[PDB]
């Protein structure tokens, strides 16, 4: 009774915290943690993963966010909005003594039917792959502050994924470990660019290394270049004053030989995850080797795939077969800093996006906003179909669920219809956020959809219920199915819990 009432409310609360960010008239959130760290964003997953939620139900609603984010990438604000709907609706049904088991089944059945509908009303991406995908990329950018440059960012998002996308069984596959995305402040948004290669935010380890190497043999280590001290308690015993220099020379030789090995195998560049001893640094430098250090592991992998290298952790056995390849490696100043660009990679299905923003917190959102597009054009590409956005498909699923409800009649039907009303949350939010009258738009929305206008959504700019695919607001089918999936799974969980104790 109460545990439930309390849970449902706590949950709905989180939903609302995110509702206002849905769509093109979406608003953003400012989040300041304990440490005073500020995150000003629109990305609902971030807003959620960020906020300080305590109520267990609230944590469960947030569990939704991350999961929707995980599988698809776009639609976490959507998933949350629906989970609140379903919960707020079940709240009504619960008052009429409808058993939470009935509500859970009904919700489950409606959900199933909802995904079917999306498949039905979906549309295979035809030969318009280019402009279709572009239209998708843009709609994504429309909610984010990146809208400012949605045209350029969308082209970049489209270009980047198209590049790393392998069309195998007449079907595409996109490995994101082929798209390196870096953010560097001190440039306008429009300045964001696509760099064929893998940019690493690291400069050469020593003043004397060259600023550019052409036709580079990239040696990738996952071990530091330093003298190896044995595993056993080892001690040097000097009884003759002469031995002192002999020992010191031997230690320098060991390092001078590590460099020799890497060099002997034809390595031109040495990118290591670990540290490079200062003396070893001298040697590489002297050998004319461009070497970076303490590089990010994630980056290490990307350089691997790109250059066809192998991450050697046993320098003594670094073979020529272990060398990556790139047309040229060069240190370039990206504004204030110096970055290392490995261009002309052996594997051309590897590319980088350099997000530019005048300010830290600005470029940070810019980076989040783009990742959202990538995930979209990618998810779309893979799926192969798309659905009309702007609440059209929601209004559609809402429409079809009211029918199915009449078929699978009973108390089940009450739950199925509420599920419909809940899905309608999207059009309401979208309208609300712009300024449109929810109840009026929703009524007109229902009309058109009743009359079989499966693509009539809310053009939040004109306030009219137009053709969403026409005006170009479209989204990958994958986004919609999960949101409804993650959303109903939260509602059902919270809905079975009749007591919460410690």
């Amino acid at each position: 009774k109460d545990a439930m009432k309390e849970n449902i409310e706590a949950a709905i609360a989180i939903s609302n915290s995110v509702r206002s960010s849905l769509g093109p008239r979406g608003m953003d959130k400012m989040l300041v943690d304990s440490l005073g760290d500020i995150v000003i964003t629109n990305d609902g997953v971030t807003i959620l993963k960020e906020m300080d939620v305590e109520h267990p139900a609230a944590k469960m609603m947030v569990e939704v966010s991350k999961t929707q984010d995980s599988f698809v990438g776009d639609g976490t604000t959507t998933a949350v909005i629906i989970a609140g709907g379903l919960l707020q609706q079940a709240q009504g049904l619960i008052n009429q003594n409808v058993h939470p088991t009935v509500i859970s089944e009904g919700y489950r059945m409606a959900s199933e039917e909802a995904k079917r509908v999306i498949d039905e009303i979906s549309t295979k991406i035809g030969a318009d792959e280019k402009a279709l995908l572009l239209k998708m990329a843009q709609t994504s950018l429309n909610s984010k502050s990146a809208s400012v440059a949605k045209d350029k960012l969308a082209e970049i998002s489209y270009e980047a994924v198209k590049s790393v996308a392998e069309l195998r069984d007449g079907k595409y596959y996109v490995d994101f470990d082929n798209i390196q995305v870096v953010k560097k402040q001190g440039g306008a948004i429009d300045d964001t660019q696509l760099i064929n290669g893998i940019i690493v935010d690291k400069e050469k380890v020593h003043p004397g290394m060259p600023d550019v190497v052409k036709d580079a043999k990239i040696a990738l280590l996952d071990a530091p270049l330093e003298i190896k001290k044995p595993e056993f308690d080892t001690n040097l015993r000097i009884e003759d004053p002469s031995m002192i220099q002999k020992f010191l020379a031997q230690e320098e030789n060991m390092l001078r030989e590590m460099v020799d090995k890497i060099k002997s195998v034809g390595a031109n560049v040495v990118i290591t995850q670990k540290g490079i001893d200062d003396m070893a640094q001298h040697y590489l430098s002297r050998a004319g080797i461009y070497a970076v250090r303490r590089v990010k592991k994630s980056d290490m992998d990307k350089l691997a795939k790109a250059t066809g290298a192998s991450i050697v952790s046993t320098i003594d056995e670094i073979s020529s077969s272990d060398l990556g390849t790139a047309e040229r490696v060069e240190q370039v100043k990206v504004g204030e800093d110096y970055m290392t660009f490995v261009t002309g990679c052996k594997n051309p299905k590897a590319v980088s996006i350099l997000v530019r923003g005048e300010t830290e917190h600005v470029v940070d959102e810019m980076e989040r906003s783009i990742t959202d597009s990538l995930h979209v054009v990618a998810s779309a590409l893979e799926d192969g179909a798309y659905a009309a956005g702007g609440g059209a498909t929601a209004a559609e699923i809402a429409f079809r669920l009211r029918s199915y409800a009449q078929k699978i009649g009973g108390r089940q039907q009450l739950a199925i219809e509420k599920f419909a009303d809940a899905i309608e949350e999207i059009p309401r939010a979208l309208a609300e956020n712009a300024g449109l009258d929810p109840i009026d738009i929703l009524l007109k929305l229902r009309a058109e959809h009743a009359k079989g206008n499966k693509t009539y959504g809310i053009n939040v700019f004109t306030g009219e219920i137009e053709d969403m695919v026409k005006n170009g607001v479209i989204e990958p089918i994958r986004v919609g199915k999960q949101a409804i999936e993650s959303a109903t799974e939260a509602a059902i969980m919270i809905l079975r819990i009749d007591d919460v104790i410690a």
């Binding site: 139900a57 071990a223 308690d233 040097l236 015993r237 969980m493 007591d499």
Partner: protein, 503 residues
């Protein structure tokens, strides 16, 4: 300290309370509880034992009722809610006999008589059958009030199959070592994606990138020790007097790892599953040799693997002969979800299988796992016992009817005591009904008569919205669970009943 009446009524009050905490989780239309600690945090379950092990019980007496759920669970698997609810009811029913003047002991003797008697009626009215047809039925019912989706039939089938695939026969009887069924889980959304692997699954990746992505006709070596540089038990120190030696010593190390790998290759083993760590240089050469290695393998697993593939767990690589290597048609790493896992299939010994559970969220996978375990345990028992009972209040209603009759054929005070046990048994039907939202009393009234007219199998039919034929609906309670529930409950109820002074 509390003496007499105070202590007793107080004790019965405690038990009653802890008992109601789980009452609403009983049956199909059951609910779940959400327990939240301080760090790990939210745990949402329908499982009786869980809700209690995690629950913070303070009152001694309540701690005792909790003990029966943990026992019911580890001893019989299913029935943890029942045994708790039943102990609460036997203590509650006794409180009346107590007020009337009946002595705790004679009450304890009535419960003995009653339970011993019921322990015969059920075994008398128990229904034999071992066919997959009913094994499947035991399963479906064990998964009821749980949040498993609509896939239950699919899950039931996995369970029946796993049990049957590991059920062995010895001197005439069938044995099912549930330990041969390895259940695991992985967040990936699906629940239908729950794979039934005819082998052993290990949540581990191969230690080194260059290692074979898959290994056919594998000679599997299980290793107790860590493929790392070991140090002599008696403290050692190395004194280098010549600069040259500094390298020689660094080489001994390398050549050490090379040989470890050599011993391994020499045995014929091409797959190395190490319970402990593996050094990066050892990895270099295992990879160079093309051996698929996995480090820090769980001992629990090291053991199942030993049993499934027939390998001997060896520590000293010097005793790593071809004689102690296990067999598997294929040892392959495959990415299940976000995680990469090692699949060992075609094991020398077929009586070893896995159930890789999928489902989303996280909170949903854990529970689905908990549900699948109750199912696995009871299907297993039933496979061995070959007997079962009519579920959903049926068995109870019958026992209650017969026991109230046996009561009359007993003395004065003890009769009162056994009539009390008869009523306590009706707590289950009443509960299933209450939760379903139907009318307890009438349900009971109707259920009594139908069972009285001889309809053994009429249980509480939530669908028919009242009573109904459990035979048809196929709701079957495994024998062993009923009995341990009854016996556990009586033993603990008696324990608490005699306590006249708590200090």
């Amino acid at each position: 300290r509390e003496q007499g009446k105070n202590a007793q009524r107080n004790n019965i009050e405690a038990a009653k309370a802890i008992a109601d905490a789980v009452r609403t989780t009983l049956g199909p239309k059951g609910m779940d509880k959400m327990l939240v600690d301080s760090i790990g945090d939210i745990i949402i379950s329908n499982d009786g034992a869980t809700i209690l092990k995690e629950m913070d019980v303070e009152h001694p007496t309540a701690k005792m009722i909790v003990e029966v759920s943990k026992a019911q669970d580890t001893a019989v698997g299913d029935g943890t809610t029942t045994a708790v609810v039943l102990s609460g009811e036997l203590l509650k029913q006794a409180e009346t006999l107590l007020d009337q003047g009946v002595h705790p002991t004679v009450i304890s003797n009535g419960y003995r008589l009653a339970v011993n008697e019921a322990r015969k009626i059920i075994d008398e009215i128990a229904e034999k059958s071992t066919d997959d047809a009913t094994l499947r039925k035991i399963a479906l019912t064990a998964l009821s009030g749980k949040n498993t989706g609509l896939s239950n039939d699919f899950l039931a089938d996995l369970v029946v199959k796993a049990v049957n695939a590991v059920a062995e026969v010895r001197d005439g009887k069938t044995i099912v070592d549930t330990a041969n069924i390895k259940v695991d889980k992985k967040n990936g959304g699906s629940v239908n994606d729950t794979q039934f692997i005819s082998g052993i699954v290990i949540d581990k990746e191969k230690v080194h990138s260059k290692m074979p992505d898959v290994v056919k006709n594998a000679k599997i070596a299980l290793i107790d020790s860590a493929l790392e540089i070991k140090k002599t038990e008696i403290e050692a120190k190395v004194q280098i007097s010549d600069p040259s030696k500094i390298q020689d010593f660094l080489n001994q190390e390398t050549n050490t790892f090379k040989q470890m790998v050599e011993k391994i290759k020499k045995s014929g083993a091409n797959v190395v599953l190490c319970q402990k760590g593996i050094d990066d240089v050892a990895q270099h050469y295992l990879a160079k040799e093309g051996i698929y290695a996995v480090r820090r393998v769980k001992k629990s697993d090291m053991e199942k693997l030993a049993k499934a593939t027939g390998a001997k767990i060896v520590t000293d690589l010097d005793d790593l002969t071809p004689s102690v290597l296990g067999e598997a048609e294929t040892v392959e790493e495959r990415k299940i979800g976000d995680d990469r896992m090692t699949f060992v299939m075609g094991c020398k010994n077929p009586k070893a299988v896995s159930i890789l559970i999928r489902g989303g969220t996280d909170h949903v996978v854990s529970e689905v796992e908990r549900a699948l375990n109750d199912a696995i345990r009871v299907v297993a028992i039933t496979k061995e016992d070959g007997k079962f009972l009519w579920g959903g209040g049926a068995v109870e209603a019958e026992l209650a009817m017969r026991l109230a009759k046996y009561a009359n054929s007993v003395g004065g005070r003890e009769q009162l005591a056994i009539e009390a046990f008869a009523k306590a048994l009706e707590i289950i039907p009443r509960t299933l009904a209450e939760n379903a939202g139907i009318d307890p009393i009438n349900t009971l009234i109707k259920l009594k008569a139908d069972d009285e007219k001889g309809r053994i199998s009429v249980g509480v039919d939530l669908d028919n919205n009242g009573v109904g034929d459990m035979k048809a609906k196929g709701v079957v309670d495994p024998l062993r669970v009923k009995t341990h529930a009854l016996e556990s409950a009586v033993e603990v109820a008696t324990m608490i009943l005699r306590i006249d002074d708590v200090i």
